[PDB]
Write a protein that binds this ligand. Structure first.
Ligand code: MYA
Ligand code: N8N
Length: 411
């Protein structure tokens, strides 16, 4: 039963999202003027805080709250350790709204106890092409297309409540207050993902992992040593051999992206993402922000031939704290970010991603089965991991789609 989510304009059952065919809002139309100008009441001991994302110490404070209290695996062996530079990058894209970053502090000592972040995204989120066609066949195209235009909405990430404060109903309050701030900005939809099942996802996809340093991975117990490896003389030598990668990329004219590549990367990205039902639209400034290489944060390479960019890939780094273990502090994971291929099969392009990642010291490469990510799983030796990433809209009815129809990558 859901005391909070039942009060919210989201689909309430799996049933509701099977019956849905057109995109559009769920709630009553409202106006900025309908929305309370004052922050949601919270207890006397606490206060609403808007971190300054240009302040190293506000960034640090958020960093600490996530380092100690953010998402762990089911066995409390690992916890994400997003870096400060990653958080400045993710929290401050072009035209970000400082007010959408919502925090609760203890008034006495200014200890950060809870956080959620919103950032702008321009999202295509109209009726999927299929439902759009089924709609003509039944005479209802204008209705199916009403919301085809890309929409400036809020993307929510980094909801975190201090472990000492869990199950005190603080997360509802953070969400109501984020919602109020976003609504005051005249934005009525949001997009979010979670590893947990909430009401009600529009898409769900498994995670996949590709071992790059399997000895470390087994050592920290991220990976097992499969049963067929027993019947073998020296387990690890077989495993390392199985996962070994070339030292240098195979595509000649792969190089790191540079500022002048922005317009071309934009165009082959937009062309590719445009084929999916749900996907972001980026300006040049968003392309530079999200894809220009940044040290220990995002890593992007283009294939250029005859002075033209014809393919590119990117990945970002999130290290995970290894929670038990005396020998290892961190596990260094690369996450497949946006890419586009026009001159070579995707599997050949993403082999270079794995090669570069391995070459720079990453232990595993991770992704969700969105985009055409299923297309290279077998050949590059990715295996399905635990659990699923679920995709959600706030205040947006949307039919249930497959993850291969989603082109929004979450940080
Ligand atoms: C238009 C603008 C809209 C803007 C907002 C759009 C929506 C944004 C929504 C947020 C998108 C987040 C995207 C990400 O960042 S997903 C990552 C979420 N973060 C973590 O998992 C970090 C570790 N966990 C924690 O920090 C806490 O356990 C959290 C904060 C997750 C819950 O704190 P706590 O454990 O102390 O519980 P409570 O007593 O305060 O509250 C219990 C209520 O909270 C509902 N709950 C539990 N987990 C989640 C979850 N991941 N999303 C949404 N709701 C969740 C739960 O069903 C229950 O409601 P109800 O079942 O009683 O009805
Ligand atoms: O990349 C890593 C490093 S260890 C593990 C993990 C799980 C939960 C929280 C942090 N890290 N992990 C992982 C596993 C499954 C999904 C995701 Cl997004 C990350």
């Amino acid at each position: 039963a859901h005391a909070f989510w039942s009060t919210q304009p989201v689909p309430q059952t799996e049933d509701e999202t099977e019956k849905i065919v057109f995109a559009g809002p769920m709630d009553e139309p409202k106006t900025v003027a309908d929305i309370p100008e004052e922050p949601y009441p919270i207890a006397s001991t606490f206060e609403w805080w808007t971190p300054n994302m240009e302040a190293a110490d506000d960034i640090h404070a958020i960093y600490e709250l996530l380092r100690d209290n953010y998402v762990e695996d089911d066995d409390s062996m690992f916890r994400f350790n997003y870096s400060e530079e990653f958080l400045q990058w993710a929290l401050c894209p072009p035209n970000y709204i400082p007010d959408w970053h919502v925090a609760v502090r203890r008034k006495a000592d200014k200890k950060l106890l809870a956080f959620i972040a919103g950032v702008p995204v321009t999202l295509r989120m109209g009726t999927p092409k299929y439902m759009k066609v089924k709609a003509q066949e039944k005479g209802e195209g204008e209705e199916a297309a009403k919301y085809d235009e890309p929409r400036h909405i809020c993307e929510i990430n980094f909801l975190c409540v201090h472990k000492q404060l869990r199950e005190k109903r603080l997360a509802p309050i953070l969400i109501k207050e984020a919602t109020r701030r976003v609504n005051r900005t005249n934005v009525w939809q949001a997009v979010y993902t979670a590893g947990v099942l909430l009401p009600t996802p529009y898409a769900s996809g498994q995670y996949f992992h590709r071992s790059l340093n399997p000895e470390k991975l087994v050592e920290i117990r991220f990976s097992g040593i499969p049963a067929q490896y027993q019947k073998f003389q020296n387990p690890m030598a077989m495993l390392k051999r199985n996962y070994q990668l070339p030292s240098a990329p195979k595509n000649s004219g792969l190089r790191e992206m540079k500022p002048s590549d922005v317009p071309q990367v934009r165009r082959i990205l937009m062309n590719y993402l445009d084929s999916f039902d749900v996907g972001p639209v980026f300006s040049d400034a968003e392309i530079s922000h999200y894809l220009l290489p940044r040290d220990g944060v995002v890593f992007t390479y283009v294939v250029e031939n005859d002075k033209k960019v014809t393919d590119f890939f990117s990945f970002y780094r999130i290290p995970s704290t290894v929670i038990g273990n005396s020998n290892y502090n961190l596990l260094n994971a690369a996450y497949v970010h946006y890419y586009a291929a026009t001159s070579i099969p995707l599997h050949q392009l993403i082999l270079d991603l794995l090669i570069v990642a391995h070459s720079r010291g990453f232990d595993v490469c991770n992704m969700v089965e969105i985009l055409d990510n299923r297309s290279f799983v077998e050949q590059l030796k990715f295996g399905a991991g635990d659990g699923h990433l679920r995709y959600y809209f706030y205040n947006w009815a949307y039919p249930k789609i497959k993850p291969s129809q989603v082109a929004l990558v979450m940080l």
